[PDB]
């Protein structure tokens, strides 16, 4: 990432209380790990912004470094990287994802 891309990424992750950078769209995920996170956000009825990194290589590579998480999906909550698919699944199983979404929506 360049400093302009970093500034854009900072604005982008803060634009909605929950942002999901993923393979595909929320109606059409293109990979099972991406679908697992979309279904979790629907189970918890979380409004969120879905962003398709398969059609933006510079975004994909910048986000990999910004989150320090090289694979997708990448879930950001409250303007901060929360986690990837495995972190999100374990958070759904413990209630911790709902706690973070609640924190963001109430902030």
């Amino acid at each position: 990432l360049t400093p302009q891309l970093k500034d854009t990424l900072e604005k982008l992750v803060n634009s909605e209380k929950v942002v999901l950078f993923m393979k595909g769209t929320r109606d059409f995920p293109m990979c099972g790990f991406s679908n697992t996170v979309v279904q979790i956000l629907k189970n918890l009825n979380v409004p969120f912004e879905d962003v398709n990194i398969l059609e933006n290589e510079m975004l994909r590579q910048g986000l990999k470094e910004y989150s320090n998480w090289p694979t997708f999906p990448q879930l950001y909550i409250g303007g901060e990287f929360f986690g990837g698919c495995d972190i999100t699944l374990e958070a759904f199983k413990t209630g911790e994802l709902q706690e973070e979404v609640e924190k963001a929506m109430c902030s």
Binding site: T71, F82, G83, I87, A91, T94
Partner: protein
């Protein structure tokens, strides 16, 4: 990066009661899955816990091509 370096950097920092590191890159030392259990994770919400693991492997992160932190558990979550 080798599996042993991933394991040691996480160990010296996080003081884990259990750590698992799996090289998923075919032994290339380039992609890993990680499970950690530590009492250091108590009192911390998962985002803060993820930051601790990322700070622990900060040097490795500059080189690797994937990381999947799967668990960052208290001992009570590890063994309910």
């Amino acid at each position: 990066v080798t599996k042993e370096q991933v394991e040691a950097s996480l160990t010296s920092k996080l003081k884990p009661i259990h750590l698992e590191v799996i090289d998923i890159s075919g032994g290339c030392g380039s992609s890993f899955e990680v499970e950690v259990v530590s009492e250091q994770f108590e009192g911390k919400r998962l985002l803060e816990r993820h930051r601790m693991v990322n700070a622990a492997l900060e040097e490795e992160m500059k080189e690797i091509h994937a990381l999947s932190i799967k668990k960052a558990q208290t001992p009570q979550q590890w063994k309910p």
